[PDB]
Design a protein around this ligand. Structure first.
Ligand SMILES: Nc1ncnc2c1ncn2[C@@H]1O[C@H](COP(=O)(O)OP(=O)(O)OP(O)(O)=S)[C@@H](O)[C@H]1O
Ligand SMILES: [Mg+2]
Lengths: 337, 364, 205
């Protein structure tokens, strides 16, 4: 039992001591920082561990080098973009002038400011980002600024002026998604005491966190079965009885979309078809409630236009999958005929 | 009396101690937090289900079991906080509601959020594991999605010691409402509660009325079958049983009366009990619609058809004001659709009910 | 609404006087009956918070609360959200004027009948005989038939009776069918024709 618990604990989302398969990016960041201690923009997909690797390398530099002050800040913690200005000042001690005068000092330790999730610092005129990027290139500047983002167009959409002036272009580094071999290496690094899951994770999103969750859930199911390839595929397929009136309603809507060919059907015509089908088989608030319940299950989508009749209905499932979801052909034939 | 006892047992607020109808789900939940309580590590789970599936009751029963286990010094002590989304005047105010629950301090929304962030991000004094329950998640939405992001991201931190369970009705919420990083955080941890089968409903009803012989098996079976064929909800089943008891105070006929009185629409009888002039107006509208085929008609053509029908029927010539008053009275009870506040002779009229229902009401 | 609820319950001393938005003072503390006139307007609020809280405390096991709503719309069920609709006990009463024309005549006869507590008894008996006689007059029945065809609502009947009684003086202690005819004529004139009649030659051209 302790083996399963330890395997679950090791495979958590907490930042580990070592992050393999990312040695190239870590080396690039280390060389950049060591050159600028004796403007960086990291862009990457979610789950690439950019925050974890940057924290690890910053801790390593703190351990090995002295004479610099490192300031972390998360943009999500700020309700307003402008609120970045005080939060920085509170970490070092009109306010922007005080920041500049404290940053342009002739004598002073280097400052390494990192703002996680840079994309949240957007402004109606992008002024804050412009000032932040123009700070390192002022007179007597001692700033090494690092910006982490998931968006790939921050250097494109937000900063045309920095492309206009050659001196103010930062150095960009992108984090490619983890490949299957890299995921396998990380997984075997976690368990020093698989390929199929790594392949699916790489093909879908390449998110190491998703693979960790998949293997954690597989371990959970295995330990539950014991206490009482198959597990991994089972969990992934799991993530990646209907009321009779709802069956009649969805069959009527399918008949309507097959008949009149329109993509979206008004609720009144749907109710009329439902009543006709019920009369055929001898079986408006109830109809709308059933439509809402079907929307809850994710079978049907509703464009809500603030009125009962104006709310439009559409499907989300292929016809063949709809037919095969039904376990009885007698009802199918009866409704068709 | 036996009927009084049955009424008392069938009340909604009379929660049972434990019904194994959801035990499986219970067991699953009974593992998850338990592990999160034994490893001193936080977690997050999203549970989506249609209303009336007993999600709140199941969560409360699990919390009761965990509290009882903690009182028996088998689980390390923990602090439980429960918040309801729809019981809050403003979204951001939840930051206060949590804070005052854990420290009792009064602060503004921004300051409360800052203090909560500081407490959950900084290595403070070792506190008991925090079990946070949030109800009606979809009502905490914001165009900036900051509150939801923080709620589902804070337990990720090791120092948080936070376990969060998000109860909601829509299973699509983490995909089409939740952004990418937070979607994967709740991903692979979605519990879906299916509606009760008629067997489950019958078991629940039998458990409600154990050792009590007041209802026949046929009536209970028919009530459960009807509920399964309509919505599969326990609340309306209990309401139908209560109404059937009330009628029996005055067989399957009682349950049939309850179900067809508390579910059926009253449009037909309201039309039937309408006045003669209103009936003539409706007939004129139907005739004009048949002549034209459109679902919108101006008030002038309707008035002309009404005048023709009155002449055919021999009724006295009606004035425009009387017709407009009748139209306003009909529109007040939402039988039609009109905006007669400013326009008088150029009013678009739409039927609020199906034409065949009108025909079946007017044929008699 | 919260301010009115607090003030009517005389808990402002307990809750507090300032404009503070916290309402958990009542909510935590919360047999009291609620009456809600024009219930449809509450459904148009931003989140239906008050209705949801009332239904929740009704379904809760803390204190007994009885909720009574009044509505003119027949579609009050669809104006509610799914949650409150599920928590709403489907108890409906319908008030329709389900009675025939003779019953309307009986209602008219009874409404204009003096009570038994009036001081003068012979005058009351004469008044009752007079209204009984006026009941079967065919002009009065024609007026009642016209108004009954127009609308069965008792409010219009009360208005018509009030206007008829306005023309009751000392010289005419007891009403007349011609008085009811005059009242019916006064109640049933079209404004558009009057406005057109009040114009000038150039406007007519
Ligand atoms: N395990 C159970 N077996 C039988 N009946 C149950 C069970 N759990 C709850 N119920 C009943 O079903 C009702 C609905 O339970 P709730 O949890 O309040 O509904 P819900 O699923 O939370 O949906 P809402 O919209 O939040 S009320 C309860 O009030 C009980 O009367
Ligand atoms: Mg609930």
């Amino acid at each position: 039992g302790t083996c399963y618990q330890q395997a679950k604990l090791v495979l958590n989302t907490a930042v580990p001591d070592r992050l393999p398969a990312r040695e190239r990016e870590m080396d690039v960041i280390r060389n950049f920082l060591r050159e600028h201690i004796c403007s960086l923009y990291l862009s990457g997909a979610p789950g690439t561990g950019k925050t974890a690797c940057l924290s690890r390398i910053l801790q390593d530099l703190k351990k090995e080098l002295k004479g610099f002050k490192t300031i972390m800040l998360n943009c999500m913690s700020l309700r307003t973009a402008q609120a970045v200005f005080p939060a920085i000042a509170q970490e070092i001690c009109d306010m922007m002038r005080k920041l500049e005068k404290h940053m342009t000092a002739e004598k002073g330790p280097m400052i390494v400011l990192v703002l996680d999730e840079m994309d949240q610092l957007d402004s109606k005129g992008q002024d804050v980002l412009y000032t932040l990027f123009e700070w390192p290139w002022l007179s007597n500047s001692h700033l090494v600024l690092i910006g982490i983002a998931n968006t790939l167009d921050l250097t494109d959409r937000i900063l045309p002026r920095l492309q206009a002036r050659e001196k103010c272009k930062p150095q960009l580094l992108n984090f490619p998604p983890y490949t299957r071999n890299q995921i396998v290496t990380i997984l075997q690094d976690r368990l020093n005491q698989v390929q199929f899951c790594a392949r699916k994770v790489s093909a879908v999103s390449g998110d190491v966190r998703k693979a960790l969750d998949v293997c954690r859930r597989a371990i959970e199911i295995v330990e539950s079965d014991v206490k009482s390839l198959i597990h991994i595929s089972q969990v992934i397929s799991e993530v990646d009885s209907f009321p009779l009136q709802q069956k009649i309603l969805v069959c009527s809507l399918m008949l309507l979309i097959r008949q009149l060919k329109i993509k979206e059907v008004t609720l009144g015509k749907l109710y009329e078809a439902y009543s006709k089908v019920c009369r055929k088989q001898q079986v408006q608030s109830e109809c709308l409630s059933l439509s809402g319940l079907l929307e809850a299950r994710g079978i049907l989508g509703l464009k809500r236009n603030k009125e009962t009749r104006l709310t439009k209905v559409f499907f989300k499932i292929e016809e063949k999958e709809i037919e095969h979801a039904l376990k009885d052909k007698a009802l199918i034939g009866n409704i068709l005929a | 009396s036996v009927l009084e006892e049955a009424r008392l047992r069938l009340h909604v607020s009379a929660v049972p101690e434990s019904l194994p109808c959801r035990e499986q789900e219970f067991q699953d939940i009974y593992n998850f937090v338990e592990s999160k309580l034994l490893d001193h590590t936080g977690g997050c789970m999203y549970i989506s289900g249609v209303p009336g599936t007993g999600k709140t009751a199941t969560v409360h029963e699990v919390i009761r079991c965990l509290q009882q286990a903690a009182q028996a010094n088998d689980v390390p002590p923990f602090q439980y906080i429960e918040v309801n989304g729809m019981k809050l005047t403003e979204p951001h105010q939840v930051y206060v509601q949590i804070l005052q629950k854990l420290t009792g301090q009064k602060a503004t929304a921004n300051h409360a959020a800052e203090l909560l962030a500081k407490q959950f991000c900084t290595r403070g004094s070792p506190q008991e594991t925090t079990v946070l329950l949030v109800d009606e998640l979809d009502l905490l939405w914001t165009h900036k999605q900051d509150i939801m992001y923080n709620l589902f991201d804070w337990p990720t931190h090791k120092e948080a010691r936070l376990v969060v369970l998000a109860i909601a009705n829509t299973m699509d919420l983490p995909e089409r409402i939740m952004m990418n990083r937070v979607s994967s955080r709740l991903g692979l941890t979605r519990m879906c509660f299916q509606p009760y089968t008629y067997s489950q409903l019958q078991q629940i009803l039998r458990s409600r009325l154990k050792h009590l012989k007041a209802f026949e098996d046929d009536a209970i079976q028919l009530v459960a079958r009807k509920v399964a064929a309509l919505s599969g909800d326990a609340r309306r089943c209990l309401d139908i049983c209560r109404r059937a008891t009330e009628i029996c105070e005055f067989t399957i006929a009682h349950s049939m009366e309850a179900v067809d009185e508390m579910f059926s629409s009253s449009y037909i009888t309201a039309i039937k009990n309408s006045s003669v002039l209103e009936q003539s107006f409706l007939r004129a509208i139907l005739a004009e619609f048949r002549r034209s085929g459109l679902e919108e008609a101006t008030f002038q053509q309707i008035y002309s058809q009404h005048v023709a029908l009155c002449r055919m029927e021999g009724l006295p010539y009606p004035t425009m004001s009387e017709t407009m008053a009748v139209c306003s009275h009909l529109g007040s009870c939402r039988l039609l659709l009109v905006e007669p506040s400013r326009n008088d002779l150029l009013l678009r009229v739409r039927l609020n009910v199906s034409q065949d229902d009108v025909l079946y009401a007017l044929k008699d | 609404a919260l301010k009115e609820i607090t003030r009517q319950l005389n808990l402002e001393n307990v809750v507090g006087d300032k404009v503070f938005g916290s309402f958990a003072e009542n909510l935590s503390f919360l047999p009291v009956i609620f009456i809600l006139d024009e219930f449809d307007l509450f459904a148009h609020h931003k989140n239906q918070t008050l209705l949801y809280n009332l239904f929740d405390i009704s379904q809760s096991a803390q204190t007994p609360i009885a909720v009574i709503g009044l509505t003119c719309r027949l579609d009050i069920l669809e104006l509610l959200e799914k949650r409150v609709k599920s928590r709403f006990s489907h108890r409906q009463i319908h008030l329709m004027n389900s009675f025939g024309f003779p019953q309307y005549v009986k209602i008219f006869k009874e409404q204009l009948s003096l009570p038994a507590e009036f001081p003068d008894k012979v005058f009351a008996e004469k008044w009752n005989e007079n209204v009984q006689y006026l009941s079967e007059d065919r002009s009065v029945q024609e007026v009642l038939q016209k108004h009954f065809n127009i609308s069965k609502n008792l409010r219009s009947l009360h208005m018509l009776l009030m206007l008829a009684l306005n023309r009751v003086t000392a010289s005419h202690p007891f009403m007349t069918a011609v008085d009811l005819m005059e009242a019916s004529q006064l109640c049933s004139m079209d404004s558009k024709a009057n406005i057109v009649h009040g114009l000038s030659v150039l406007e007519i051209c």
